[PDB]
């Protein structure tokens with residue numbers, strides 16, 4: 001996989017963020033994770049976490065996987081990085097996302113994220129508390 005440049009437009013929630021990519025505004029849905037909705041428990045925490053990460057980053061990068069790049073809602077599907085650190089993995093490691101939505105064609109970092117989830121779960125973090 002390869003990392004591509006993008007710029008933050010707006011934080012949205014734990015697992016969606018609005019970026020400018022190849023010069024076009026686009027909502028991105030984070031691959032392989034599921035954060036609680038803002039109205040659910042840990043939803044506010046997940047939004048705050050992703051917000052700080054993308055807002056504090058001097059460099060945002062988008063990394064598509066091998067399958068479809070857009071979902072049925074028009075959202076881009078990618079791994080998102082903030083100064084080199086993967087937001088998707090970071091949310092899981094903190095127990096603010098579950099590994100989820102593992103689809104056949106777009107699963108490259110699956111075992112990486114499950115390792116992070118095992119450690120968050122081991123540590124009883126947030127969702128796992």
Ligand SMILES: Cc1cn([C@H]2C[C@H](OP(=O)(O)O)[C@@H](COP(=O)(O)O)O2)c(=O)[nH]c1=O
Pocket residue numbers: 029030031032033034071072077101103106
């Ligand atoms: C993460 C991801 C979600 N989706 C779709 C599946 C779900 O369909 P449904 O809307 O029919 O539930 C929806 C869940 O995303 P959200 O968790 O943002 O709601 O987005 C994909 O198709 N591919 C993906 O890689």
Ligand SMILES: [Ca+2]
Pocket residue numbers: 015034035036037
């Ligand atoms: Ca969600």
